[PDB]
């Protein structure tokens, strides 16, 4: 129980099933332990769950790499099988109920929910394979079955981790989803990159050039005259309502100049983020600026696929294992704007 | 540990060291446990201690009779040795630290406080014998050391329990105190009786007559004409400020007539109790009406020991193992008033 | 200051400005004080105010009789001048702001609310006289200004107190109201009686007979054959929805037979009370049973004033210093039902 | 929405879908509403749920009779369909999730739990008919399916309600269970009676005699000489540990003599209740005294069915729709003791 | 209500009167919403107001530019008319009551308070013009009336915004204050600049030189030999008590060197801030270092107006629409020190 | 009391015994004060102590330099005499009880605890000299008595402060510890340096070279070939478990390259810290990486004292006034690894 989980956390960094106790006060949203003559705060509840339970779930993070939470949400994963994923930005669990982790939150392994199974847990593959409605995460292709191949990054202990020769946790995942004992077989999709304004590195020569070039030079170099990059990507700050700015790399490049404030009402990994943004020289502002983190070469691809001869169209692009809708507006053979709905 | 304590409480009624776990939530001031499909509340913290600890001390409460708290307080007992005492009216523990009971609240035995030891704990006698400043409680005379002999009642699981041939927990306690490794010699002493307005039973013929007789018939039967019983005991409710009423039997008799509201600002076993009393016919009230529950015969004895000559006098009485002081005001060879301070 | 207030409450029963300090903890909704070796709870916040403030207003409560809250509410008294009134059922104060009582909740006297002043506070009369929109309460007629004369009862320290030669706080209040520096002229008025199912005493011969007589014997003794007393007063518990029962004496009589459960959603002194009532033999229930506690004679008088000709009618009655409306439904020259709205 | 729910509760007694808003504060465990110049408390959360939600489920409580909770628990009812059941003793709901009642706590109907459906909800029958694992409650036999017929009482708005010609909610429930889309065949069964020490009414001639007769006169009237009624039913309070007392009528009879303190660690409707009991003359106590409230005639029937030959035996009895086990210890052709486990 | 405000915030960035609901838990100081399968924290109360209300007020920020809060405080603005201002540093409202914004906090528009009206709200100008005691904020001069012209900056969504050709919110405000239906006409004042140690840009050539020059060169360049700039502006760190340092630009220049820790006990926009400062090389420290953010050319002006022939004088300067007092000490024709009282 | 402490804090920066009050709300974990028309947050409880008390203790920080908390912990200081030390990282007191500081937490000056006395308090030297079990902190040597000389740094108002010609608080302390009226006389020890990854400056030429050189050059320059510096100090990130990295300067140099995340479960000054570390390129990770902040020349000294001819040894080094144990593993005349247990 509680004292034992506190011991594990202090001694072994997290829950490992070791034995031993520490004294523990549970005080509103906080967990304290008596170390020597001092009471020391081990935990601070940002959950809707009883402070002692949240702390348990935390201590019982799964400490391995996995797909970013947005992907799981888009696959409609409800709950995990015999493990629990900690979202560090939120300081909470993915979901609210659990299976074979914590008695208080455990629910019977049943069963209309989309259960998420991971190959690194003992015989979860066999279990997944017997389960009507489920998701499977695997570091390796499984036979022949239809498979959503993951992107070139993954989530590990709070950080985003990029695929490469030297990585010691798995980054490239193979995802499987069965709906009524039948495997799902979606159309290939593009991926967002889970970068932020604190942690942004470019991924192509286009992105490198974008972050360093004058806007007029960049546009001219890549034949983007007709694609409204100044409104849509670079963003427009001369007006009372702040214009465009729907691609992250543009938001990143902009904030790095020091004159931007943003709030995000609904925080956490997601295919689309919405910001409440103010430019602090012009006072240009927008209450909902919807932004997406596509690789810029990828974003450009999508635009150049558009029929510019049509005034208004709902564009529908497979991303992060769903369909994302953009509005596209055009006039006189040019993009006026392009944004997420 | 927490869930093990929950298991003992549910399965065994209190803590007895049996093995087992139940799932537990700690939610602010409360403790819940999963039982079938429900979350049931098992505890309501009224302590200044962390809910999970207050619950543990509760479960570890000592299930045995003991001298009433006010005696412990008056012998200046600071803490108990290897047990803990639950006060059911307050829903708290006697004191705040503990010894050999709960790791979080245990202080080291060594210090110069008055530690209270009990014969029912193996080896506490001998420990008490090798401790300079301490209190000892026992069901039996120990050799011939100087001994305070307690009253004909004791506290058990929230109730007052009276001495008799049928009682199966001890009620007569032999109480020892040491200071500088030297026993204190008892001052012979009167005892308050720990009754209340809900649980009150007369203890002598005088007390019985008191509860049933017209006031004029009683005063004259017992020769109290010069002792202001009307004011002091019966109470005077004819004035804007409630007169007298300093003896509990008089307060009980009174309020059982249904026309009294009381408010006790500071609750708990005590030789003196202070009430904020109002009478609902006359609107007579007193913010601080000090009240002692003496055997009425004993209260009468004290008054008849006193010089009705002196106008004013602090009278010193040995009661409940301390000295208790009253003011006595007189005029023309009679008592005007008599009250504690 | 906090610890000084604690000192007054403990030593003096309430706040009277005496000097002294006690140690105090503020723990969520509670106040504790060190006393000997224990932490004793002195207060339980049931307010929307910070615990330490709610405790202060409590201690500063005015210890005197006053008109019952529903009268203050019906004269639209927003705040009190240099005193504060404790409601013991709610364990809160009347209103939310204060004047000249506690620095944290004091608003400036100047504003256009109805300030309630009291004769027992030095200089409040004259202040009331130089204030345009206000209410004045006093124990005595003031010269000959237009005056509402209160009922034969009042509130004191949580109790209802009845007028008599023995009462030592005032009960008969003379109540003044000013609007635009102009006195309002009283409408003669009936008064509800502030009784309840725990504390209920008959007030007339009719009320006594009511509580003891078979229903058929009473209806006929007082000529109520055409007034549906069975439905309206006695109550009908033969149907799935509890019929009638709109007068408190009828509800009291009923529930004292032991087969009634009530739930009052919104508690506190009020001319009308709404109950969620269930009868435990018949399972008859009504989610909203509106109830007035009129002297039964007064309720009878009103009915006998009415035209049994009209099928439906909103009847307007001056009560408790406001206008109170009832529906009266009739059929074939008799009352079907009669209730407040 | 919150303020609309507040409006229904205040104006309509509970939630019925009427339109309107009231201002509401959510303060820790409490709900307040502005009414005139005051903040009135409308709710006290005793749940593990967010205060504003607990309040909603409360307001949406189903206002109708139903089988007592312990029956639902014993049929293993996990959740209700399109209604929610309030437990007034606990001030909580039956279970923790909900279906078609509150958006925050609604889970999808699809899953393999036992969903409890009710005839009084339009279309619940047919839904129950197309659901594999479920429980059905109704006021009327449904065709001829296998049917458990409930007892002569039921729960309504906090009370126990008895069958009779005058009852205006149903009391006799016909109860169905399906597992694998297959009805379960009822085992004939005895019922506990859901009485308590505050609300207890005898149900047979034997029960009446029991409550009034000297013990020796009763034992002999009903031929119980070989059945240890003294120990088992009357209770033995002569020893340090309270002997027997396993039947509620015996506990009631006893405690109404005023010399008993009980503490129930785990509260709520249940076929077996466990008490921590103390007798205040003899100080006899038992931390875990298991108690069943059977019709006394039924308890007698069971004992007279048993072999007084065997020294020890687990006896299995169908009660409250489950199997209930007792130990029966015998010696020299008589009962020593008999208790639940 | 609450669910609708949550919807607005998620969908539209803030409250805009749109329609729709989201499920919402209110859990102590936090607001969560159910998004997909996760509970997501939308709000964290740093207010004294009920968590649901604070969140309402927030969602109902006025999202436009306005004068910094210090100016409103100095004008003694009590409350705002039909809008509410969010202080982002504090995470609270300006004030505690509201008008025409939130039912729970709304108070009648009356009325001894200094009500603050803004021209961008419909007919607030007409309202202000009819109101006895009020403040008016306007982006344009209003006729002829005496007018406090604002500084060259303003507060917008958490940031300070400087006046210029390109600004899209109003920065230059014209402020009006009536006290008894009479317009106030103060002496021209100077302004503080609302800069901090995180966000500091200079505003003159003097300030540029100050941030980059050796101290001896700067003083010599501007003839400040006799004005104690080393003590007063640069600050002195060689002594046990930390010397001078009362001008922000000096505090800024100093901290930027990396060896300064500061606490501020009473946070928020203000004409004078007080810091608890420690220099981490010398351990020089001061418990109350009072600092003011005057434009340095402005600060210098003030000093050079002083009669240096006088030992001690209370200097009185109009700033931020009040009078600020400085102590000035001189000896031998030089400033020893200059600081705020 | 509380209002006075609030006044002191606002007016004078901290508690100084001055007189005056401010209004104050105590609201859960927060303290607010009414300043003008706003409620302003003065305090946020991270303690286990009642919010009003924690705030008192804080306001009553001792505002002077002192030895880092790790040293006091290693000397087993229990409590301080007439002062209280604030740990700013934790936002808590050293310890939980107090002496002559705050009535609520004050315990009698007695007495088996190791009481800590400081020379800067009046006659604490005389008191210490009369006390059986105690610690003494002094800015100067006291006669002849055995003395632990402090390191070349100290803790002051939240920062670490280095000894030097210019320091105005004492940095070099002389520490004394008596156990039974007998002075303790330990073997000279080495010291850790209380640096962090936020605040790190080197202290020798070796440390300067370490922070700037290629690893192969540094090792070659200092003849560290046989001491496994690459594993132990620089750390190894090519493996699934993150290798070595037990010296802070190595952790510092590493994190400064931008690819490291760390959690610390048990925060606060300590001789050994444990981190939960992830390298964000390789995903190399360790759940408990134990780190020590020795001066690198000092760490090297210790290694070069080791017999490399032995496979496994518990090395025992006097540090920070205790003994710290390291594991040392060797093979083929080389260190494989060296770490704290």
All domains of chain F in start order, with CATH:
1-63 (3.30.160.820), 64-186 (3.40.50.11580), 187-341 (no CATH)
Q: How many CA atoms lie within 13 A of D165 on its CB side?
A: 0
Q: CB distance F32–C50 less than 8 Å? A: yes
Q: Quick check: D38 and C96 in contact, CB under 8 A?
A: yes
Contact C113 E112 (CB under 8 A): no
Nearest to F2 among C1, C27, C102 (CB): C1
Q: CA A175 to CA A168: how far, in whole Å? A: 19
- Of E187, E232, E256, give the one whose Cα is nearest residue E327: E232
The size of the B-D interface in CB pairs under 8 A is 90
Chain D residue at shortest CA distance from E56: D25
Run of H or E residues at B156 = strand B153-156
Give CA–CA dist F53/F49, Å, rounded.
6
Interface membership of B35 toward D (CB under 8 Å) = yes
CB atoms within 10 A of CB B315: 16
Q: Which residues pair with A98 in a beta bridge?
A: A106
Q: Give chain B's count of helices (H) and strands (E).
A: 9, 18
Instruction: Label each residue of chain E as H, E or C.
Output: CHHHHHHHHHHHCCCCCCCCCCCEEEECCEEEEEECCEEEEEEECCCCCCHHHHHHHHHCCCCCCECCHHHHHHCCCCEECCCCCEECCCCEECCCCECCCCCCCECCCCCCCCEEEECCCCCHHHHHCCCCCEEEEECCCCCCCCCEECCCEEEECCEEEECCCCCCCCCCCEEEEECCCCECCCCCCECECCCCCCCCCCCCHHHHHHHHCCHHHHHHHCCCHHHCHHHHHHCECCCCECECCCEHHHHHHHHCCCCEEEECCCCCCCCEEEEEEEECCCCCEEEEEEEECECHHHHHHHHHCCCCCCCEEEEEEEECCEEEEEEEEEECCEEEEEEEC
Q: Scanning every residue of chain B, which has its alpha carbon at the shortest distance from the alpha carbon of C12?
A: B288
**Measured between CB atoms, does F29 come within 8 Å of chain C?**
no
Active site residues of F: 231, 246, 286
As a whole number of angstroms, the distance between CA F136 and CA F130 comes to 12
State the CB neighbour count (10 A cutoff) for residue D256: 12
Tell me how far the alpha carbon of residue D36 is from its chain's centroid.
41
Is beta strand D115-118 parallel, antiparallel or unpaired with respect to D79-80?
parallel
Closest Cβ opposite residue A113 in set D48, D50, D111: D111
Residue D288: other Cβ atoms inside 10 A: 14
Answer whether C291 touches F (CB < 8 Å): no
DSSP type of residue C107:
P
Residues of E with Cβ-Cβ distance to C113 under 8 angstroms: 108, 110
Residues D252, D241: Cα–Cα separation, whole Å: 19
Are the beta carbons of A200 and A208 closer than 8 angstroms? no
Q: Which chains touch F (3 or more CB pairs under 8 A)?
A: A, B, C, E
- How far apart CA D62 and CA F268 sit, in angstroms, is 53
CB pairs under 8 A between E and F: 90
Task: State the Cα–Cα distance between residues A325 and B7, nearest whole angstrom.
Answer: 54
Mutate to test the interface with E, among C49, C95, C113 (most CBs of E within 10 A): C113
- For chain C, what's the residue count? 341
CB contact under 8 A, C21 and F53: no
List C-alpha distances in Å: E88 to A213, A242, B8, E94, F28: 35, 21, 50, 10, 21
**CA separation for the pair F71, F321 (Å, rounded):** 7
Q: What is the resolution in angstroms?
A: 2.7
User: Which residues in chain B are contacts of C9 at CB distance < 8 A?
Assistant: 265
b or e along C134-152 (b: 16 or more beta carbons within 10 Å of the residue's beta carbon)? bbbbbeeeeeeeebbebbe
CA distance A157 to chain F (A): 7
Tell me which of C66, C70, C246, C253 is the catalytic residue: C246
How much of chain F is in helix, strand and coil states, percent to nearest 5?
Answer: 20, 30, 50
Q: How far is F63 from chain C (nearest CA, A)?
A: 24
Residue C72, both tokens: 């203050």
Both tokens of residue C20? Answer: 């002294």
- The edge-to-edge listing of strands for the beta sheet with F174-178 is F79-80, F115-118, F134-138, F174-178, F148-149
C91 close to C49: Cβ distance less than 8 angstroms: no
Q: Does residue F265 belong to the interface with chain B, where contact is any CB pair within 8 Å?
A: no
Extended strands (E) in chain D: 24-27, 30-35, 38-44, 79-80, 86-87, 92-93, 115-118, 134-138, 148-149, 153-156, 159-162, 174-178, 260-261, 273-279, 285-291, 312-319, 322-331, 334-340
Whether F285 has its CB under 8 Å from any CB of chain A: the answer is yes
The region, left, alpha or beta by phi > 0 then psi within -120 to 50, assigned to residue C260 is beta
Chains linked to C by 3 or more Cβ pairs within 8 Å: B, D, E, F
Catalytic machinery residues of D: 231, 246, 286
Q: How far is the C-alpha of E250 from the C-alpha of E338, rounded, in Å?
A: 14
Report the C-alpha gap between C164 and C170 in whole angstroms.
10
A246 is annotated as an active-site residue = yes
Q: Nearest C-alpha of chain B: how many angstroms from C20?
A: 17
Of B48, B50, B111, the CB nearest to F112: B111
CB B39 within 8 A of CB B33: yes
Calculate the alpha carbon distances from B160 to C240, D256, E192 in Å.
48, 18, 71
In whole angstroms, what is the distance from residue C15 CA to residue C59 CA?
Answer: 5
| Residues of B belonging to the active site | 231, 246, 286
Helix axes F51-59, F2-12, angle to 10 degrees: 40
Q: Is D201 on the interface with C (CB under 8 A)?
A: no
Closest CA to C39 of B54, B290, B289, B274: B54
Q: Which is it for the CA torsion B119, B121, B127, B128, positive or negative? A: negative
Q: Choose the catalytic residue: A231, A253, A273, A295.
A: A231
List of chain A residues whose C-beta atoms are within 8 Å of the C-beta of residue E166 = 238, 281-282
With 0-12 CB in 10 A as exposed, 13-18 as middle and 19+ as buried, what is A263? middle
Q: Which of A44, A41, A106, A52 is nearest to A80 (CA)?
A: A106
Give F281 to chain C, closest Cα distance, Å: 46
Query: Quick check: bond before E111 cis, omega within 30?
Result: yes
Residue A89 near chain F (CB below 8 Å):
no
DSSP B294: B
Q: Which residues of chain C neighbour F104 with C-beta distances below 8 Å?
A: 23-25, 34
Query: How is residue E47 written in tokens?
Result: 């207010």
Chains that touch A (3 or more CB pairs under 8 A): B, D, E, F
**Chain C positions in Cβ-Cβ contact with residue D13 (cut-off 8 Å):** 265, 274, 276, 286-288
How long is chain E?
341
Do residues C97 and C276 make contact, with C-beta atoms less than 8 angstroms apart? Answer: no
Burial of F341 (0-12, 13-18, 19+ CB in 10 A): exposed
**Residue (of D144, D180, D175, D190) closest to D77 by Cα position:** D175
Residues of F in contact with C34 (CB under 8 A): 103-104
DSSP tag of D108 = P
Contact in structure between B334 and B231 (CB atoms under 8 Å): no
Number of cross-chain residue pairs from A and B with Cβ atoms under 8 Å apart: 56
Helices and strands: H and E segment counts in chain C: 9, 18
- The residue annotated as part of the active site, out of C14, C30, C172, C231, is C231
Residue B28, chain F, CB below 8 Å: the answer is no
Task: Using CB atoms within 10 Å of the CB of residue F5, give its burial: 0 to 12 exposed, 13 to 18 middle, 19+ buried.
Answer: buried
Chain A residue numbers touching B103 (CB-CB < 8 A): 21, 23, 34
The C-alpha R_g of chain E, in whole angstroms, comes to 23
Of E35, E65, E157, the CB nearest to A266: E35
Q: CB of A161 within 8 A of CB of A64?
A: no
Cβ neighbour number for residue C89 with a 10 Å cutoff: 11
CA–CA gap between residue D12 and residue D283 (Å, rounded): 51
D32 vs E contacts (CB less than 8 Å): 50
* Whether E204 contacts E295, CB under 8 Å: yes
Q: How far apart are CA C256 and CA C248, in angstroms?
A: 12
Q: Do D13 and C287 touch (CB under 8 A)?
A: yes
Q: Does C14 touch chain B (CB under 8 A)?
A: yes
Residues of F in contact with B99 (CB under 8 A): none
Quote the tokens at residue C260.
């009634």
Cα separation of C179 and C133, whole Å? Answer: 5
Cβ–Cβ under 8 Å, residues E34 and A266: no
Angle (CA) F67 F73 F79, round 5°? 90
Which residues of chain C does E112 touch, with a Cβ-Cβ cutoff of 8 Å?
A: 108, 110-112
Residue F41 near residue F49 (C-beta atoms within 8 A): no
Given a contact as 3+ CB pairs under 8 Å, which chains touch B?
Answer: A, C, D, F
Using an 8 Å CB-CB cutoff, list chain E residues near C49.
none
Which tokens belong to B250? 């008089």
Taking the CA of residue E165 and the nearest CA in chain A, the distance in Å comes to 9
Experimental determination approach used: X-ray
């Amino acid at each position: 129980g509680l004292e034992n989980i506190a011991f594990n956390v202090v001694k072994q960094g997290h829950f490992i099933g070791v034995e031993g106790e520490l004294p523990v006060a549970v005080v509103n949203d906080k967990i304290f332990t008596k170390s020597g003559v001092n009471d020391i705060c081990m935990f601070e509840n940002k959950t809707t769950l009883p402070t002692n339970i949240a702390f348990e779930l935390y201590a019982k993070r799964a400490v391995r790499s996995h797909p970013d939470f947005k992907l799981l949400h888009n696959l409609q994963a409800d709950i995990c099988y015999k493990f629990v994923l900690w979202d560090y930005e939120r300081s909470n669990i993915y979901g609210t109920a659990t299976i074979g982790v914590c008695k208080y939150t455990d629910i019977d392994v049943n069963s209309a929910l989309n259960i998420c199974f991971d190959i690194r847990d003992n015989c979860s593959l066999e279990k997944f394979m017997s389960t009507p409605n489920a998701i499977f995460i695997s570091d390796r292709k499984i036979k022949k079955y239809p498979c959503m191949v993951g992107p070139d990054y993954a989530y590990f202990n709070g950080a985003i981790i990029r695929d490469s020769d030297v990585v010691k946790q798995p980054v490239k995942f193979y995802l499987y989803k069965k709906v009524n004992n039948e495997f799902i077989d979606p159309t290939e999709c593009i991926y967002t990159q889970s970068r932020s304004c604190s942690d942004f590195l470019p991924l192509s020569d286009m992105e490198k050039d974008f972050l360093s070039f004058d806007s007029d030079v960049f546009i001219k170099k890549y034949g983007l005259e007709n694609y409204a990059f100044e409104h849509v990507v670079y963003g427009d700050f001369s007006h009372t309502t702040l214009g465009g700015l729907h691609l992250l790399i543009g938001l990143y490049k902009r904030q790095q100049e020091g004159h931007i404030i943003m709030e995000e009402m609904l925080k956490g990994s997601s295919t689309i983020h919405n910001y409440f943004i103010t430019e602090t020289n012009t006072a240009a502002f927008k209450a909902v600026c919807s932004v997406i983190d596509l690789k810029l070469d990828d974003f450009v691809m999508i635009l150049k696929s558009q029929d510019l001869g049509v005034v208004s169209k709902v564009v529908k692009v497979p991303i992060d294992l769903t369909m994302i809708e953009f509005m596209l507006w055009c006039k006189d053979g040019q993009v006026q704007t392009f944004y997420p709905r």
